[PDB]
RNA sequence: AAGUGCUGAUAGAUUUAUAUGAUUACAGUGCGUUAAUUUUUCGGAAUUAUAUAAUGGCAUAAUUAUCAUUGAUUUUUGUGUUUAUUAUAUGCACUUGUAUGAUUAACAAUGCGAAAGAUUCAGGAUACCUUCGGGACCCGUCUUGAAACACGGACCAAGGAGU
RNA sequence: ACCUAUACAUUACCGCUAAAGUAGAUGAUUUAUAUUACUUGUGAUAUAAAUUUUGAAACUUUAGUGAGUAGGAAGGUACAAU
């Protein structure tokens, strides 16, 4: 999908020896509503006793990050399992939206390390301003004025004629 | 998806839209683009495309 | 109720070009003036109880 | 922002012009106050003057099973699925010849050297503008690669 | 009385007159005319309407059972207005450019050539066999001489032989195509009045000598997805 | 001529990739096609030369052992390196897919009328739309020479023959357009002449 | 001249082709008239693809139009004249074929008598024989 | 979520409902109070009281029962209130009207079962030949498993085995 | 996006399986009309025409449903005699 962002809150349903059990919350990136509510329990079966049903999911909501046209560079903290090899990482991407730079992580982490997305865990995601971004492929996209004449298209192959007539001479200068 | 033309225009890179809008009219793009030397050759889109019967 | 909406939105063209209103859309709204009498009877005939 | 499309794209019916839901231009013109109205670039094949050309190019096959009820065509210019969605419902015909006449000129003068199997295009097939057509009988498959004539009649506009 | 109120067809699920018999009714003094005619009566004085033994009987012959009646419902015509220049897709005039004049109660299209111009009479074509171009030809004060009815112009007829009843025949009769002498008076009426119109147009693509050539299209253009 | 398009579609093989031009042509030839691919010594193969050396040198050791004459006949032209492809992509064991290679004539060194007839480019199979920077390619020109094609310099001299008289037929035509642009002057006062075409073109005046 | 019956139906058919008995192409001993194979490794009994097709009740024709001839009628073998008097008022569902046993002598009467009761005989011009 | 407002196409359409049981209940059209209001003036058009429990709305009483309890949610309602909404108060005739009896029928064209004589339109892998496409191993048997590098079988007619 | 099964679905047809209905026809039922009791109104009577068997081992209605060796049961079918 594209990994929207949620804030999912727990309960430990309130049995009589203790009413009002203490309401923990998470920050979950999942493609959909209901899979966000089951990451929550996989990440509750490590920190609190608390399973379903011994617990509840009190109000979650999908959140809609704050500035969708600022050009912030995210820095995510990560934990992932290899073939033999559960490892911490720390990765950085440039994106307008937070859930766009967690899904930027997955398709990159999954390619570069083979990393199937059930063995990746997000352990922090924050915007990191500048002059803290390490990660050389970010901090070359910093310096205004950035000239960069990569004459770029997809250059749609080829066009509406299969047997075209015109020999498309890319450069056009 | 986007192809490039011969027209730079000056802003800061942190510009809000209102001052791009200020700059977009000030360097007078609107009149010199509809005479750009193959922006006439755009206008088979307005004349040779579907060119009714 | 959707009928009166398209009645109201074609009268948005009477903001724009103000054309007619000859036998087509004022006649759609002229009946309201005769429907005013329902409220004009409401001041004289609904005061019976 | 996208509120305009409940206004701007109704202007086609004041470009009809009938009952004018939006009298705005989007005039498709060269005016610098006009860079709108969304022309999809491009495809320009006629071969549709009348009898739009098309081959017959196989049955509605699976891999290893054939379903000769339905033909698969290949229209002369059509290249994506909005193109071959035009021809659906048109009485396609496959025309060929035979040695016999065996018959008179009964209605307007008939020589009978030419055989036609009439059909009707039914639906779209490809993701790129091929098309299926159920015929009257069933297309003998040495007709694969031979031309059938998609008609232009019965025509929506 | 009054209050028709049948608002059926732009909704398309309402009528709205169950709201009428509320207070509108007199609910009393019910007197009505109440025809009670026994006139369908076999009062064979000399009348003899049994009916008599033509048969009244069990002569045995069997044919189907009876035919539930579609009547002339609505006819959708897509938007062709008189007189839009047409292109014809069948019927001895295929490819000729013609001008419509009238859309009739049979849901068809009256079409003139002009027969003077295009050799096409006031024949009658469906909306299925025709391709309506973009814009109009102005016909603001044309009379459209309404005795040109659809019902007015069958082939009249094949009386199975010459109205005498039970008669003889040789093959190859010509009883269907004069063409009608009155029709030649209606043809010279329109093609007089149409030709004063159609030369006064701005000669665009289809106004003056501009009908007269045989549709088969050309480069850089369409059957697929045109602004046609 | 006249056909489903013409009775030919002439394709230059220059600068195209060998197997993407094959599966375009073997699909189009089953549509009822008639192509005629020329300059087959110029088809580019991907990978460098000692990749495709080894692969053509492995396809020739596949010969029958009982009797080698029956075994795979390994044709060594460039135009038969390519015709071998368009048989892997065609049902050649059927009477349908044997008439589909009998529309295919394939030439190497552009002869005899396919030198005046307009020949077209298949941009889906061009090299410089497909293959990256840094990536070496080959040509089937040198592959067939290094596997025994005895006519490489035959056709290179025949190319320079028809390259040489192309300059004679362009200098017939370069000045002839220069006559047209002078012939275009005398017609600007024809009657009302050019106005009806220029009001829909005008971008070429 | 006989009117086809009782305002005829449209006789439509699952297979026209008749079922033709495994390996009868291969052997001259085997008649083409169907046998169900019983034998174990048999791909026709097992209903493999592109082998042929067996009978079953699923190909059974419409119960209205079952045994109806091309003419909408149903047969009735007539063997002498006073069997035609059975078809005096069944001449509107049934039709007669004169048997093969019935000779040329009597057939001339059966044909003439069945012209009066308007039945549609399905083989007149049998034993004509414009001869002795 | 609402029909919101539709526009396009596709395939299909049982029925001898008496060849031993509604074609009728529905609704829809065409005649017989009223009065002003309006509009076009050629229609239409609108209007109240006409009888509801009134259901929704408001106020209030009242009580059942509760997330949490300032409260909210009700529950039984009841009254008052006006704001709306809905249904009932269309018989007598008469239609080629719509529905419903596994909801296909109106319009035309083409063609004459034609005295014997004889064409038109559809169909016919009947049992083959011609042309293509797709599928497609040889049966019987024993066997866990047979196309088997398992056994029998060259072919054909007669005979031939649960009494 | 799209292609693809003997699966899913809606329809026609074949069988199966399970239910359900019909037999006073010197009766039932229409359409009219004469008369009528009249209850305003609807029935009952006379006339004229009309429809109304089925190997009830039949006919009509409705729904689901269909793999099969070895194997068992039903219904047909070929041969020849009394």
UniProtKB/Swiss-Prot annotation, chain B:
GO terms for biological process: cytoplasmic translation; negative regulation of neuron apoptotic process; ribosomal large subunit biogenesis. GO terms for cellular component: cytosolic large ribosomal subunit; cytosolic ribosome. The gene is RpL14. Belongs to the eukaryotic ribosomal protein eL14 family. Signal peptide: none annotated. Keywords: Ribonucleoprotein, Ribosomal protein. This is Large ribosomal subunit protein eL14. GO terms for molecular function: RNA binding; structural constituent of ribosome. The chain holds residues 54 to 106 of 166 of the full protein.
From Swiss-Prot, chain C:
Signal peptide: none annotated. Belongs to the universal ribosomal protein uL4 family. This is Large ribosomal subunit protein uL4. The gene is RpL4. The chain holds residues 345 to 393 of 401 of the full protein.
From Swiss-Prot, chain F:
It comes from the Eukaryota. GO terms for cellular component: cytosolic large ribosomal subunit; cytosolic ribosome; ribosome. One of its GO terms (molecular function) is structural constituent of ribosome. The keyword Ribosomal protein applies. InterPro entries: Ribosomal_uL13, Ribosomal_uL13_CS, Ribosomal_uL13_euk/arc, Ribosomal_uL13_sf. Pfam families: Ribosomal_L13. Coiled coil: none annotated. Keywords: Ribonucleoprotein, Ribosomal protein. One of its GO terms (biological process) is cytoplasmic translation. The keyword Ribonucleoprotein applies. Belongs to the universal ribosomal protein uL13 family. This is Large ribosomal subunit protein uL13. It comes from Drosophila melanogaster (Fruit fly).
UniProtKB/Swiss-Prot annotation, chain G:
One of its GO terms (cellular component) is cytoplasm. Pfam families: Ribosomal_L32e. One of its GO terms (biological process) is cytoplasmic translation. Keywords: Ribonucleoprotein, Ribosomal protein. The keyword Ribosomal protein applies. CDD domains: Ribosomal_L32_L32e. SUPFAM superfamilies: Ribosomal protein L32e. GO terms for molecular function: structural constituent of ribosome. Belongs to the eukaryotic ribosomal protein eL32 family. This is Large ribosomal subunit protein eL32. It comes from Drosophila melanogaster.
């Amino acid at each position: 999908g594209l990994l929207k962002e949620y804030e999912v809150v727990g309960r430990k349903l309130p049995s009589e020896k203790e009413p009002q059990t203490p309401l923990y919350k998470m920050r979950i990136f999942a493609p959909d509503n209901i899979v966000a509510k089951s990451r929550f329990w996989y990440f509750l079966r490590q920190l609190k006793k608390f399973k379903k049903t011994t617990g509840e999911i009190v109000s979650i909501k999908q959140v809609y990050e704050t500035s969708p046209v600022k050009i912030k560079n995210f820095g995510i903290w990560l934990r992932y399992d290899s073939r033999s090899g559960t490892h911490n990482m720390y990765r950085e991407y440039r994106d307008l939206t937070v859930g766009g730079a967690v899904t930027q992580c997955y398709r990159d982490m999954g390619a570069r390390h083979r990393a199937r997305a059930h063995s990746i865990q997000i352990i922090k995601v924050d915007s990191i301003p500048a002059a803290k971004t390490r990660r050389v492929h970010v901090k070359q996209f910093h310096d205004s004025k950035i000239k960069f004449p990569l004459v770029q298209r997809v250059h749609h192959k080829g066009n509406r004629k299969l047997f075209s007539f015109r020999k498309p001479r890319t450069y056009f200068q | 998806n986007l192809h490039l033309t011969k027209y730079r225009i000056k802003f800061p890179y942190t510009a809000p839209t209102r001052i791009v809008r200020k700059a977009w009219t000030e360097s007078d793009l609107k009149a010199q683009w509809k005479v750009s030397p193959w922006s006439v050759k755009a206008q088979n889109i307005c004349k040779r495309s579907s060119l009714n019967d | 109720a959707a009928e009166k909406r398209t009645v109201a939105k074609v009268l948005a063209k009477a903001k724009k070009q103000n054309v007619e209103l000859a036998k087509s859309h004022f006649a759609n709204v002229a009946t309201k003036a005769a429907a005013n009498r329902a409220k004009l009877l409401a001041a004289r005939k609904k005061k019976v109880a | 922002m996208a509120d305009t499309q409940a206004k701007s794209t109704t202007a086609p019916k004041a470009a009809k012009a009938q009952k004018a839901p939006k009298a705005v231009k989007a005039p498709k013109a060269e005016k610098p106050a006009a860079s709108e109205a969304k022309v999809s670039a491009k495809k320009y094949k006629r071969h549709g003057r009348l009898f739009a050309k098309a081959v017959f190019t196989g049955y509605k096959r699976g891999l290893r099973n054939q379903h000769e009820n339905q033909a698969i065509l290949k229209i002369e210019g059509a290249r994506r699925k909005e193109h071959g969605s035009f021809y659906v419902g048109k009485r396609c015909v496959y025309v060929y010849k035979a040695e016999t006449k065996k018959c008179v000129p009964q209605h307007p003068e008939r020589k009978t050297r030419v055989r036609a199997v009439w059909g009707k295009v039914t639906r779209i097939h490809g993701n790129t503008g091929a098309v299926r057509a159920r015929f009257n009988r069933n297309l003998p498959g040495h007709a694969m690669g031979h031309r059938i004539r998609i008609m232009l009649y019965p025509s929506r506009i | 009385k009054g209050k028709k109120h049948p608002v059926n067809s732009y909704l398309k699920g309402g009528i709205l007159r169950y709201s009428k018999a509320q207070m509108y009714k007199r609910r009393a003094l019910y007197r009505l005319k109440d025809k009670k005619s026994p006139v369908v009566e076999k009062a064979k004085v000399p009348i003899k309407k049994s009916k008599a033994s033509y048969p009244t009987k069990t002569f045995v012959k069997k044919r189907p059972s009876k035919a539930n009646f579609s009547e002339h419902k609505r006819n959708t015509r897509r938007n062709l207005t008189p007189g839009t220049v047409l292109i014809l897709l069948a019927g001895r005039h295929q490819g000729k450019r013609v001008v419509l004049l009238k859309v009739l109660a049979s849901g068809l299209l009256l079409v003139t050539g002009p027969f003077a111009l295009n050799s096409c009479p006031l024949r009658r074509v469906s909306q299925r066999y025709v391709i309506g171009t973009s814009s109009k030809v102005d016909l603001g004060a044309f009379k459209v001489p309404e005795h040109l009815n659809d019902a007015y112009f069958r082939r009249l007829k094949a009386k199975k032989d010459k109205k005498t009843g039970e008669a003889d025949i040789f093959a190859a009769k010509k009883e269907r195509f004069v063409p009608n002498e009155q029709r030649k008076k209606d043809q010279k009426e329109v093609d007089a009045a149409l030709l004063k119109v159609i030369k006064a147009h701005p000669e665009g693509k289809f106004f003056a000598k501009y009908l007269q050539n045989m549709f088969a299209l050309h480069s850089s253009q369409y059957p697929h997805r045109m602004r046609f | 001529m006249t056909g489903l398009t013409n009775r030919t579609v002439v394709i230059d093989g220059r600068g195209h990739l060998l197997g993407r031009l094959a599966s375009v042509v073997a699909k189009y030839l089953l549509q009822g096609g008639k192509v005629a691919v020329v300059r087959c010594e110029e088809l580019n193969l991907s990978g460098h030369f000692y990749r495709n050396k080894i692969k053509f040198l492995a396809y020739l050791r596949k010969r029958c052992n009982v009797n080698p004459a029956r075994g795979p006949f390994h044709f060594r032209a460039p135009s038969r390196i390519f015709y071998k492809a368009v048989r892997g992509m065609i049902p050649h064991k059927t009477k349908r897919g044997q008439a589909a290679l009998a529309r295919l004539r394939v030439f190497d060194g552009i002869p005899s009328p396919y030198d005046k007839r307009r020949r077209v480019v298949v941009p889906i199979a061009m090299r410089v739309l497909t293959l990256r920077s840094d990536r070496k390619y080959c040509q089937v020109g040198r592959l067939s020479h290094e596997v025994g094609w005895h006519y490489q310099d035959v056709i290179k001299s025949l190319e320079r023959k028809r390259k040489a008289k192309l300059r004679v037929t362009l200098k017939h035509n370069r000045e002839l357009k220069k006559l047209t642009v002078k012939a275009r002057e005398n017609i600007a006062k024809a009657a009302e002449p050019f106005n009806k075409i220029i009001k829909s073109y005008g971008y070429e005046v | 001249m006989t009117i086809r019956p009782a305002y005829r139906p449209k006789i439509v058919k699952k297979r026209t082709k008749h079922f033709i008995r495994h390996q009868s192409d291969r052997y001259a001993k085997l008649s083409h008239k169907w046998r169900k194979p019983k034998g174990i490794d048999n791909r026709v009994r097992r209903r493999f693809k592109g082998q042929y097709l067996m009978p079953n009740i699923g190909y059974g024709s419409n119960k209205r139009t079952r045994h109806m001839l091309p003419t909408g009628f149903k047969k009735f073998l007539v063997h002498n004249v006073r069997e035609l008097e059975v078809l005096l008022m069944q001449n509107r569902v049934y039709c007669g074929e004169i048997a093969h046993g019935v000779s040329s002598k009597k057939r001339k009467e059966i044909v003439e008598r069945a012209k009066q009761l308007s039945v549609r005989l399905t083989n007149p011009n049998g034993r004509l024989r414009s001869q002795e």
